Design a protein around this ligand. Structure first.
Ligand SMILES: CCCCCCCCCCCCO[C@@H]1O[C@H](CO)[C@@H](O[C@H]2O[C@H](CO)[C@@H](O)[C@H](O)[C@H]2O)[C@H](O)[C@H]1O
Lengths: 1037, 50
């Protein structure tokens, strides 16, 4: 400490080093919008072509669910069984488990369930992936001159782009939206009936005439003695053209005429699946979902990708352009550039205050050197603990600017003060003064990390969010202190200009300086009156409690959030059609939306990206917005935008169309809102479970005062068509049940049969009915089976037919049949309360109706008992720290009593600005407690030291302290309030967060000082008047 | 028994294409054989956990 005061250059070297390591941790540091925040989930997705919901549930799912045992750190297992034939089992794991090890554990338990699976499933593939929902980017590809359809493009992507993007550096994963080329063979059932043939033969023939076969080798090993030719055999080669697939022979007739495939069915290169069809401004487009690599730079991955695509552009088909539907990146560009704008500015502000307050250049260059260094160094402290330049850590630094600023200031001010007071040289003034603030600065570090660290040890995804802030902030802080002990004292004693004893630069200059008297006089006024109050303090206790209570009411009556919403230049709208509607009708609506946006939002919307899929019944539309710059208004912002969209599609539409903005943390809890699981426990039936579900919907429909918008999260039972095969009639007339089945299948379901080699890439061979002969129930009739004898038999000869109900989506939670009920709490009431009333209502249900919690309300049912404890620790540790610094159990109470003085402001700040008690308002709120405590501690320190090291009296010593201490206090807070204010009143991108930090902090700061510089004195004085007896107000020694 | 240009765009290239976002991949090189063997070597940054 002192040591450096006598060594300017050694400190210069610790400084130069910190600057360089931070500079390096800057040059080689990851940037991303957020950190990994969400618990790890691994999803097993597989599909069973043609299967219905109970099919996959009873063929694939339950066999997989039962084979999923003994996998490490299981949290919860939830799966969808779809009538679209797809089944997905998401296993979410314990927070901070090794993604990669858990995911390997699952793919190796599945690789054991594999042999107990359907062969259709086993051959379409059962897959394992790690589930983020956070694609860095989604690239679209289109053709301008109407040239190709969706499926053509899908292929172009899968054979020209997906492959070179996953070669773009910075790109961690590529996923594909659409379906690759396939040999699509569409049976015409009549022309099939002619030659007395079935699908089954079509399959057979196709496998037979199309294959590779293990050929072998001429002159193989061992060859015979002397042998001289050694080379490979080329055999039956898989088919290449659609033509060659036409020229495959199905039955050679008697009359010399041959029957080809070309004849019995139509043949075309077509889509592997037509569930999902995608339209970008109406033109057909096919797409890519790119995920950011682990540790990789978001902004550079995206730029490298864009460079990859322009570099491919000299090789494209005509009018085939790349489009960029979703890019989370430029919002991150603006976020980063705006937080830097803040840091630079707030530095410039502190210079401005420091000058227009010490009117002395070389002093004013000191704190300017200081914090930059603390910055750089903290980036380097983060890089050491494995972090990245992301949202949470950067607003952690913005938030930290205050402790940083007060720390540099405290020092240079104390020096200048001691010089103006006693007339010491620069150096000797420093040591006097550094020797005065030393213990205080160390103690403040122990108390500041006494509040800032407990919050790092928060659990769950919530806890993760806190971890980012807490580490950013604490390191910035402890460093601000080591800088304040090594560098600043060194830069003070070395380059600070010496001040004439009893200078105060009063009057003196005119142009620039009338202020000094005017400040001077007033600080006198101030302290006169400080004294003035210290006569009767009682009234001031009255008002104090009043402020406390007011703070309480303000606190409770303020809205509890999780984060703020961000117009990200992009949002989405989702479309729900009447159950069983058509690909084409859903598509009508999606076009309607596409046009609405392309009409009454001509100035804001650049592009609409509609996707029909997940089952004809429902479509979704990705709405992209024009750049922020040409969207000025309060109305050209997403809130009002989605307002008018949903306003449009609510009344004047045929099916439900919500328009919404995606939250910034893309996968956690809607604050007041839960995710209920209604779990069937006993050997019950799906019918009984639904009955229980609507029953609970009713029990909550009875409580509009507690719960709000309680809704199930599934699909209802739709009418499904049942074709009962009478084994007797069919086995009688001569048709093998296999044949009736797989003909019914390969007719209406479709069938993967063979593999063919298109343009050198292996694609699939799908044979199914032509569209028209497999649409309507009566058409069942056009299909016949060749019996054992040789006769064709219609299905109505051995098939009964009826309509029934069934559900398209069979949900399972942790093994058993279950049903997901989403919900949120009433306007007034806390989420947990509504969760509790839900546990009381799901307790009101019939035998076998159990309940459980998942996702959001799980992450909250964990960390709902932790919040008070970390802060009980925080209070015991801060008090212990201050008792340490001083020498008192009771003197601390002076500085702790300050905490409210900042709160009353922040609550008042948000409320009277109409905001909400979120995280940013909280880290900010803490930050405020931090300064309250700092200033108060410096006052109390100076008070005690004057008292003990100069035997001075109480009232007089505190008075003197609060007096010499005022000028810097004001400096600090002036520097802040100005630096923060922009954050409080900015628009453009991200202004939701910015304003969230700002408002709370600012209001807090204001009440903080202009309440402390009157209450702290009274604390120290009134507190001290519950200590010992004799002596006193001594004035001796 | 299959031939090299046969195996390579069906088995080699199809596997290589999925090998992105491999942590610390330095360089990736693979052989496609008419003796039927197909082999893909992934060499990594010095000291990545094998
Ligand atoms: C950076 C600018 C700071 C300077 C501006 C602040 C100066 C004035 C702020 C004072 C706020 C508290 O208000 C102050 O309270 C005490 C009363 O308790 C008054 O003081 C007076 O009243 C009480 C009587 O009840 C007496 O004990 C005391 O003899 C007398 O000083 C002050 O006249 C008043 O100004």
């Amino acid at each position: 400490p002192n040591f450096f005061i006598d060594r300017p250059i050694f400190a210069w070297v610790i400084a130069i080093i910190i600057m360089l390591a931070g500079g390096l941790a800057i040059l080689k540091l990851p940037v991303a919008q957020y950190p990994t925040i969400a618990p790890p989930a691994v999803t097993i997705s597989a599909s069973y072509p043609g299967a219905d919901a109970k099919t996959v549930q009873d063929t694939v799912t339950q066999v997989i669910e039962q084979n999923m045992n003994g996998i490490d750190n299981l949290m919860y297992m939830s799966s969808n069984s779809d009538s679209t034939g797809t089944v997905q089992i998401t296993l979410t794991f314990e927070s901070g488990t090794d993604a990669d090890i858990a995911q390997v554990q699952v793919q190796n338990k599945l690789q054991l369930a594999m042999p107990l699976l359907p062969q259709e499933v086993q051959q379409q593939g059962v897959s394992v992936e790690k589930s983020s929902s956070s694609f860095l980017m989604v690239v679209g590809v289109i053709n301008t001159d109407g040239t190709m359809t969706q499926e053509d493009i899908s292929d172009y992507v899968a054979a020209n782009m997906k492959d070179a993007i996953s070669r773009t550096s910075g790109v961690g994963d590529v996923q594909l939206f659409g379906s690759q080329y396939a040999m699509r063979i569409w049976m015409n059932p009549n022309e099939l009936n002619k030659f007395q043939l079935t699908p089954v033969d079509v399959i057979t023939a196709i496998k037979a005439q199309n294959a590779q076969v293990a050929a072998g080798q001429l002159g193989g090993t061992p060859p015979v003695k002397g042998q001289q030719l050694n080379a490979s055999i080329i055999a039956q080669t898989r088919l290449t053209s659609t033509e060659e697939f036409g020229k495959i022979l199905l039955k050679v007739n008697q009359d010399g005429s041959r029957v080809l495939l070309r004849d019995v069915a139509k043949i075309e290169l077509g889509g592997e699946n037509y569930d999902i069809i995608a339209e970008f401004n109406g033109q057909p487009a096919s797409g890519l979902g790119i995920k950011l690599a682990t540790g990789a730079n978001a902004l550079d991955t995206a730029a490298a990708i864009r460079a990859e695509l322009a570099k491919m552009e000299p090789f494209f088909p005509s009018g085939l352009k790349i489009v960029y539907p979703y890019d989370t990146t430029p919002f991150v560009k603006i976020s980063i550039h705006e937080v830097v704008k803040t840091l630079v500015e707030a530095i410039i502000l502190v210079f401005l205050v420091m000058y227009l307050f010490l009117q002395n250049f070389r002093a004013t260059l000191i704190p300017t050197i200081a914090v930059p260094v603390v910055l750089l160094g903290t980036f380097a402290v983060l890089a050491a603990f494995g972090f990245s330049i992301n949202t949470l850590t950067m607003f952690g630094m913005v938030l930290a600017i205050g402790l940083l600023v007060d720390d540099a200031i405290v020092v240079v001010e104390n020096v200048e003060r001691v010089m103006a007071e006693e007339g010491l040289p620069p150096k000797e003034a420093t040591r006097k003064s550094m020797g005065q603030i030393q213990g205080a600065l160390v103690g403040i570090a122990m108390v500041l990390s006494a509040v800032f660290v407990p919050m790092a040890f928060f659990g769950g995804s919530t806890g993760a969010i806190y971890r980012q802030f807490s580490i950013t902030i604490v390191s910035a802080m402890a460093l601000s202190v080591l800088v304040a002990l090594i560098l600043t004292p060194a830069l003070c004693a070395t380059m600070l200009k010496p001040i004439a004893k009893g200078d105060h630069g009063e009057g003196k200059k005119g142009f620039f300086g009338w202020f000094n008297r005017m400040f001077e006089k007033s600080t006198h006024h101030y302290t006169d009156s400080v004294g003035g109050i210290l006569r009767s303090t009682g009234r001031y206790l009255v008002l104090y409690l009043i402020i406390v209570v007011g703070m309480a009411y303000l606190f409770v009556r303020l809205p509890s959030s999780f984060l703020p919403d961000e117009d990200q230049g992009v949002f989405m709208t989702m479309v729900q059609l009447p159950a069983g509607a058509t690909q084409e009708r859903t598509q009508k609506v999606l076009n309607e939306v596409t046009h609405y946006y392309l009409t009454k939002e001509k100035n804001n919307v650049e592009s609409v990206f509609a996707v029909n899929g997940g089952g004809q019944n429902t479509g979704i539309a990705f709405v992209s917005l024009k750049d922020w710059a040409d969207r000025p208004g309060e109305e050209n912002k997403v809130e009002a935008i989605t307002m008018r969209a949903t306003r449009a599609f609510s009344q004047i539409k045929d099916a439900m169309v919500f328009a919404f903005n995606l939250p910034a943390i893309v996968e956690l809890g809607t604050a007041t809102g839960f995710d209920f699981e209604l779990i069937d426990q006993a050997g019950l039936g799906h019918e009984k479970l639904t009955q229980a579900r609507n029953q609970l919907l009713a029990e909550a429909a009875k409580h509009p005062d507690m719960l709000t918008s309680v809704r199930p999260n599934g699909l209802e039972d739709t009418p499904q068509f049942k074709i009962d095969i009478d084994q007797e009639k069919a086995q009688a007339l001569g048709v093998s049940i296999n044949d009736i089945n797989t003909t019914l299948g390969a007719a209406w379901g479709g069938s993967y049969v063979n593999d063919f080699i298109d343009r050198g890439r292996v694609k699939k061979v799908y044979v199914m009915s032509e569209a028209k002969y497999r649409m309507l129930p009566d058409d069942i009739g056009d299909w016949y089976v060749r019996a054992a004898d040789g006769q064709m038999v219609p299905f109505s000869a051995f098939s009964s037919s009826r309509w029934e109900y069934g559900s398209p989506r069979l949900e399972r939670y942790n093994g058993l049949p279950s049903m997901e009920i989403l919900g949120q709490a009433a306007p007034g009431k806390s989420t947990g309360e509504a969760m509790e009333l839900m546990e009381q209502l799901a307790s009101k249900l019939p035998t076998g109706v159990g309940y459980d919690w998942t996702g959001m309300s799980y992450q909250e049912r964990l960390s709902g008992n932790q919040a008070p404890s970390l802060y009980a620790i925080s209070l015991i540790v801060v008090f212990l720290c201050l008792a340490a610094l001083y020498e008192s159990w009771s003197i601390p109470f002076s500085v702790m009593l300050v905490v409210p003085l900042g709160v009353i402001g922040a609550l008042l700040a948000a409320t009277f600005r109409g905001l909400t008690n979120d995280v940013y308002f909280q880290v900010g709120l803490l930050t405020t407690i931090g300064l309250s405590a700092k200033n108060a501690i410096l006052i109390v320190e100076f008070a005690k030291d004057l008292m003990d090291k100069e035997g001075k009296g109480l009232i007089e010593a505190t008075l003197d302290a609060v007096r010499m201490r005022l000028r810097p206090i004001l400096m600090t807070s002036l520097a802040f309030i100005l630096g923060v204010m922009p954050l409080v009143i900015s628009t453009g991108a991200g202004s939701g967060a910015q304003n969230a930090v700002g408002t709370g902090v600012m209001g807090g700061m204001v009440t903080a000082t202009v309440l402390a510089i009157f209450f702290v004195p009274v604390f120290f004085v009134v507190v001290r008047r519950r200590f010992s007896r004799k002596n006193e107000d001594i004035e001796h020694s």
